Amino acid sequence: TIPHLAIDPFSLDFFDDPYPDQQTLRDAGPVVYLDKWNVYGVARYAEVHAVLNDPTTFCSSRGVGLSDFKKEKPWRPPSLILEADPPAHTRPRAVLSKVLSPATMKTIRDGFAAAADAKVDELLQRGCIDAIADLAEAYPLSVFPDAMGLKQEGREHLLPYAGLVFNAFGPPNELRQTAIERSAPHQAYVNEQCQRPNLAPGGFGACIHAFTDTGEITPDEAPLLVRSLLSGALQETVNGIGAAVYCLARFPGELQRLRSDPTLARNAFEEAVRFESPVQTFFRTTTREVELGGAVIGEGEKVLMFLGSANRDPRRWSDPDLYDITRKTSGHVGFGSGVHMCVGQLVARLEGEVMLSALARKVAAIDIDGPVKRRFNNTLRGLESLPVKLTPA
């Protein structure tokens, strides 16, 4: 009844151009079976949204990568937030929501905006830059580690650790094997920075440790909650900013609109998140037999959700493959949906907004002027290198 496909969504050919295969996955049916990895797949907006919003049946505590924690040992101790279900999920989630709160955003916004303006001014002095290393990576590295309270030494481990985390959600392919082989120094750095003395006063990490006396989390849970912010924050934000820059270079008409109204910056970044979907996929594991898309799925089955595909499903979006900075983006699943929907989305949107604002006010043209190189990762979509010339306004 359900169609079986041989597409490997973790193959390098797929990462190089996923969009035809994503249409094949959507058009084969609401629920497919991926024979390569023995998992169910859902690639249409409707089923992805449904799975995300039914956490009791489609749980996260057996892992959100291919590996089922009831069958195999997790490669690192489970996240207390991403890899927990309600009710254990609820109070750690509340702590992170309060650490990354609207009030925190109000405290840090002016500094984040000044750093974005300064970065764009610096890049305009050079003219020809790499929009990944010099902009998409450099800007978040110039604000987020400081906002965390991390010391200067060792920050070169942050992006590699993130890459490892996201490769480890994938199947046991070469990308995953090599990531875990290289993991020791990055893991050692990250775990040590999670301890209370190593997080500067007033930053996100110190605030997590200060939140250990309310009955929501205990002191021994704070290191792993800091670890979450050192796992899934930087690389996907970098990839989203890089995708926004790529889109503004490839769609110059949209840079022209953004220049004419810099208040479009926040939505231009949200649209880049939908269009690129830096986090392409996550898994859930069924806890009981369930009907989904007319199919019956048994207990203990992995279900692969194609977030990027759901964000390009023509059943839900008009002209899904176009970058449109005035699109009504509400409802996209680039940050997930439901109880696990990105707790750090306010930070990501702040960083993306203020960078696109700086570009909107300061840059007249963004022209690709060298070979564009893609970075392969089992879960993240993003560029390795984006050579551009920036023309000042």
Ligand code: HEM
């Ligand atoms: C464009 C940038 C970002 C993207 C695309 C993104 C994507 C996502 C997605 C799709 C989820 C849902 C996971 C699931 O349903 O299993 C999520 C959760 C999460 N994100 Fe983000 N994220 C971004 C930035 C950030 C930032 C900046 C932070 C921290 C400051 C952060 C921290 C987290 C955490 C801790 C969770 C787990 C929430 C939970 O399980 O309740 N993310 N993110």
Ligand SMILES: COc1ccc(C(=O)O)cc1
């Ligand atoms: C969305 O990606 C992630 C990855 C890791 C974590 C975590 O380690 O808690 C959270 C979100």
Ligand SMILES: [Cl-]
């Ligand atoms: Cl680890």
Ligand SMILES: [Mg+2]
């Ligand atoms: Mg090797």
